[model samples]
Target chain A: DEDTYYLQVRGRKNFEILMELKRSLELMELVPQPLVDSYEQQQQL
Target chain B: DTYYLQVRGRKNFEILMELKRSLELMELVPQPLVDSYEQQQQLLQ
Candidate 1:
């Protein structure tokens, strides 16, 4: 189960916070695109 | 300045998740900022 494994590898709570932060920046349009891109890269880590 | 927010955003996420198990203790205090964050999270889904 990739979903389960993803959460297991990253710790569910950390995932949530990261997800939330990413969402925050995206909606607020506060940060630069490169920064947002870097944050997105974390998904592959 | 922009640098401060940028640095803090990176640092805060890194520090918050460093322990992996510290999530439960981080409080993630409720503020107007988080209200916006939550809305974005919902839309991103």
Candidate 2:
């Protein structure tokens, strides 16, 4: 079962007055495990 | 063995089944030919 993988990344930063400044990062990937073979599947390659 | 079959043209399930029966004997068909048939698999059809 040939499967395709996709990746996505996002970053967020938060600042609270003079109290403190914090930074947060997040990463995500959209990988379809159950692969689907479409009529144009080959064209994707 | 008709691993998969897809009916087409005016709800002719019976005709499709009969055609499938004959094709199964040929062993030329690929794994499946359902909803989304890949271009590479179309060679057999």
Candidate 3:
């Protein structure tokens, strides 16, 4: 098959290793959510 | 605060299992299937 399901990841974000993850994911044929995807910062309503 | 991401293509489950292991090595988080529209089935083949 040319396609299948997608993987979902959710949690905190940290640059200490986020850049590592971004490059790794891309190299491994996966598109990591750029900038760690949607995230919450500051107070929420 | 939290973040989310997505991965699609072949052998997703294969890599997901491995990737999760790697991720947990750094931080603990949610790796649930994006079951928004019966999407859970997407991960279970």
Q: Which candidate is the best by lDDT?
A: 1
lDDT of 2 by residue, A1-45 (tens): 123222111211111210121011011123343443442486687
Clashing pairs in 3: none
Query: What tens-digit string does per-residue lDDT give for candidate 2 at B1-45?
Result: 112222223324443344444544434555564324676577888
Name the runs in model 3 displaced over 4 angstroms: A12-45, B28-45
Give model 3's docking category.
Answer: incorrect
lDDT score, candidate 1, position A42: 96
> TM-score for all predictions?
0.25, 0.21, 0.30
Error of 1 at A24 (Å): 0.3
Full candidate order by DockQ, most accurate first? 3, 1, 2
- What is the CAPRI rating of model 2's predicted complex? incorrect
Candidate 1 predicts chain B with a TM-score of 0.34
Supply the global lDDT for candidate 2. Answer: 0.31
Error of 3 at A16 (Å): 11
Once fitted onto the true fold, the runs of candidate 1 whose alpha carbons sit more than 4 angstroms away are: A1-9, A30-45, B1-45
Please give, for residues A1-45, the per-residue lDDT of candidate 3 as tens digits.
345444444445443244355446456534456533433222341
Which residue pairs does candidate 2 place in steric collision? none
Q: Arrange candidates, best lDDT first.
A: 1, 3, 2
Fnat for the candidates in order: 0.03, 0.00, 0.46
